Design a protein around this motif. Structure first.
Motif, PDB file in Angstrom:
ATOM      1  N   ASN A   1     117.223 -11.036  56.625  1.00 53.73           N
ATOM      2  CA  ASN A   1     116.718  -9.840  57.267  1.00 53.73           C
ATOM      3  C   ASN A   1     115.232 -10.033  57.700  1.00 53.73           C
ATOM      4  O   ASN A   1     114.796  -9.572  58.800  1.00 53.73           O
ATOM      5  CB  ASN A   1     116.873  -8.667  56.281  1.00 53.73           C
ATOM      6  CG  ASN A   1     116.447  -7.349  56.907  1.00 53.73           C
ATOM      7  OD1 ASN A   1     116.881  -7.039  58.030  1.00 53.73           O
ATOM      8  ND2 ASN A   1     115.610  -6.595  56.232  1.00 53.73           N
ATOM      9  N   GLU A   2     114.455 -10.729  56.865  1.00 52.22           N
ATOM     10  CA  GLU A   2     113.073 -11.050  57.246  1.00 52.22           C
ATOM     11  C   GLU A   2     113.037 -11.904  58.534  1.00 52.22           C
ATOM     12  O   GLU A   2     112.214 -11.651  59.433  1.00 52.22           O
ATOM     13  CB  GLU A   2     112.342 -11.775  56.102  1.00 52.22           C
ATOM     14  CG  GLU A   2     111.902 -10.846  54.969  1.00 52.22           C
ATOM     15  CD  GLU A   2     111.087  -9.585  55.480  1.00 52.22           C
ATOM     16  OE1 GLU A   2     111.560  -8.412  55.143  1.00 52.22           O
ATOM     17  OE2 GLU A   2     109.953  -9.670  56.162  1.00 52.22           O
TER      18      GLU A   2
ATOM     19  N   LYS B   1     114.006  -9.840  61.536  1.00 55.80           N
ATOM     20  CA  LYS B   1     112.914  -8.850  61.928  1.00 55.80           C
ATOM     21  C   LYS B   1     111.819  -9.538  62.780  1.00 55.80           C
ATOM     22  O   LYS B   1     111.244  -8.903  63.712  1.00 55.80           O
ATOM     23  CB  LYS B   1     112.308  -8.203  60.718  1.00 55.80           C
ATOM     24  CG  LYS B   1     113.132  -7.028  60.191  1.00 55.80           C
ATOM     25  CD  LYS B   1     112.525  -6.436  58.908  1.00 55.80           C
ATOM     26  CE  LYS B   1     111.018  -6.220  58.942  1.00 55.80           C
ATOM     27  NZ  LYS B   1     110.677  -5.700  57.478  1.00 55.80           N
TER      28      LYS B   1
ATOM     29  N   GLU C   1     113.497 -10.387  66.242  1.00 52.03           N
ATOM     30  CA  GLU C   1     113.879  -9.205  67.052  1.00 52.03           C
ATOM     31  C   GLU C   1     112.698  -8.830  68.045  1.00 52.03           C
ATOM     32  O   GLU C   1     112.935  -8.225  69.100  1.00 52.03           O
ATOM     33  CB  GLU C   1     114.118  -8.015  66.031  1.00 52.03           C
ATOM     34  CG  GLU C   1     114.104  -6.630  66.594  1.00 52.03           C
ATOM     35  CD  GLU C   1     115.314  -6.431  67.629  1.00 52.03           C
ATOM     36  OE1 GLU C   1     115.120  -5.560  68.569  1.00 52.03           O
ATOM     37  OE2 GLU C   1     116.377  -7.068  67.398  1.00 52.03           O
ATOM     38  N   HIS C   2     111.430  -9.128  67.673  1.00 51.10           N
ATOM     39  CA  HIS C   2     110.312  -8.775  68.570  1.00 51.10           C
ATOM     40  C   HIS C   2     110.427  -9.492  69.940  1.00 51.10           C
ATOM     41  O   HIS C   2     109.733  -9.034  70.892  1.00 51.10           O
ATOM     42  CB  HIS C   2     109.024  -9.125  67.886  1.00 51.10           C
ATOM     43  CG  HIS C   2     108.700  -8.175  66.796  1.00 51.10           C
ATOM     44  ND1 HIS C   2     108.816  -8.464  65.450  1.00 51.10           N
ATOM     45  CD2 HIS C   2     108.232  -6.917  66.875  1.00 51.10           C
ATOM     46  CE1 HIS C   2     108.416  -7.406  64.732  1.00 51.10           C
ATOM     47  NE2 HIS C   2     108.041  -6.458  65.581  1.00 51.10           N
TER      48      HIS C   2
END
Ligand code: HEM
Length: 117
Positions: free
Chosen positions: A101-102, A105, A108-109
């Motif tokens: 998940n890190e 994240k 995703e940017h």
């Protein structure tokens, strides 16, 4: 402790990128984008790019994310497919949900840099 180290470092990234392309190249939403792509080259650029993004050594000399996908007019469903295949790759390699998940994240940017270009 960078996300790159948490994933397992260089040997883990070298295993993850080809497994990620095996999944992307079997995924109906996205495999065709790579029809004319030199996959050895692409595996090397994407290894350097994710290594740099996730806090490993920075040897990425490729295009930025807008230039890389210029002309493709990529849609949201294509980026979701990529993230899903990378998450499935890391899971299959034994990375915990918290570390995946890190990593997602950070990646995703890039979505706004490549969609609709
Ligand atoms: C949205 C779905 C995406 C599709 C369908 C896609 C597809 C592609 C294709 C077909 C190329 C190579 C074009 C050619 O052969 O010249 C490329 C280049 C590249 N893509 Fe993607 N991509 C997507 C998302 C991503 C994401 C999420 C990342 C990283 C977070 C990424 C990183 C790169 C990199 C590093 C290159 C190489 C640029 C270079 O060679 O200088 N792409 N992409």
């Amino acid at each position: 402790q960078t996300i790159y180290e948490k994933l397992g470092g260089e040997n883990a990234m070298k295993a993850a990128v080809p497994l990620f392309y095996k999944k992307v190249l079997a995924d109906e939403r996205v495999k065709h984008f790579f029809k004319n792509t030199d996959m050895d080259h692409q595996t090397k650029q994407q290894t350097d790019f994710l290594t740099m993004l996730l806090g490993g050594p920075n040897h990425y000399k490729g295009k930025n994310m807008t230039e890389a996908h210029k002309g493709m007019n990529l849609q949201n469903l294509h980026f979701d497919a990529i993230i899903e295949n990378l998450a499935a790759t890391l899971k299959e390699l034994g990375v915990t949900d918290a570390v995946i998940n890190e990593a997602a994240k950070v990646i995703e940017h890039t979505r706004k840099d490549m969609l609709g270009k």
